[PDB]
Amino acid sequence: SMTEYKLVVVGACGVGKSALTIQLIQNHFVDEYDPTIEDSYRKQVVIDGETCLLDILDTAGQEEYSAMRDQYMRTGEGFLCVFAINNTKSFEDIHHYREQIKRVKDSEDVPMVLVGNKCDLPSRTVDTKQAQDLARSYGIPFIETSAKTRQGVDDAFYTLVREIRKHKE
Ligand SMILES: */C=C/C(=O)N1CCN(c2c(C#N)c(=O)n(-c3c(C)ccnc3C(C)C)c3nc(-c4c(N)c(Cl)cc(Cl)c4F)c(Cl)cc23)CC1
Ligand SMILES: Nc1nc2c(ncn2[C@@H]2O[C@H](COP(=O)(O)OP(=O)(O)O)[C@@H](O)[C@H]2O)c(=O)[nH]1
Numbered sequence: 001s002m003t004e005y006k007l008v009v010v011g012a013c014g015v016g017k018s019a020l021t022i023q024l025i026q027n028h029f030v031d032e033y034d035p036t037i038e039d040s041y042r043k044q045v046v047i048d049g050e051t052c053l054l055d056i057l058d059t060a061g062q063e064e065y066s067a068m069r070d071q072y073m074r075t076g077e078g079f080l081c082v083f084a085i086n087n088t089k090s091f092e093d094i095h096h097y098r099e100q101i102k103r104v105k106d107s108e109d110v111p112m113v114l115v116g117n118k119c120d121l122p123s124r125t126v127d128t129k130q131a132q133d134l135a136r137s138y139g140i141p142f143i144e145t146s147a148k149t150r151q152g153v154d155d156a157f158y159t160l161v162r163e164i165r166k167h168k169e
């Protein structure tokens with residue numbers, strides 16, 4: 001059977017979790033994707049010559065119980081921690097998302113990529129160096145993305161798969 005990777009995309013409301021997921025899977029940019037909709041999305045990809053299923057939970061942080069969210073938190077093998085480069089609060093939240101992931105896995109060593117999204121915008125209040133330094137502190141990759149232009153989008157998800165593959169070896 002083809003290897004499957006359950007991935008979880010987390011981060012503050014409005015940072016582009018849905019736009020990144022839909023750009024990765026469907027190759028189009030969404031501007032009005034319901035902020036409250038949480039679902040899993042799948043795509044068969046080839047990463048470094050090995051075919052795998054990306055099985056991605058696009059989180060929406062709503063209260064209602066979900067057997068699916070529990071399954072992806074319990075068995076998910078990697079997290080995308082997304083902030084927006086024009087949203088200081090979303091960057092300040094990253095510490096809290098990483099603490100949530102550590103508690104879920106009871107581990108400091110969970111495969112994780114820091115994603116600075118909306119890098120097409122000029123209004124940059126979180127600089128590259130700040131995010132690079134935080135990712136270095138956490139021992140994780142930092143990828144700059146635009147769900148709008150596609151820059152970094154495959155790189156963010158493929159880098160997370162490479163972190164899982166390195167973790168499992
Ligand atoms: C436009 C709506 C939207 O995108 N979101 C996503 C982010 N949301 C959210 C919020 C908020 N506000 C939140 O406070 N937490 C959270 C909770 C419930 C407890 C403790 N800390 C936090 C954050 C400050 C980190 C959210 N937590 C989670 C969450 C994560 N990230 C993980 Cl790894 C596991 C579990 Cl069981 C979680 F519940 C998520 Cl998905 C979203 C949170 C609000 C609406
Ligand atoms: N300019 C720009 N806008 C974006 C980008 N990613 C998301 N957006 C917009 O930001 C808003 C929130 O995005 P969404 O993906 O729904 O946020 P979510 O709450 O994290 O799922 C929408 O209007 C998106 O079109 C990006 O890379 N660049």
Ligand SMILES: [Mg+2]
Nearest residue numbers: 017018034035
């Ligand atoms: Mg969304």
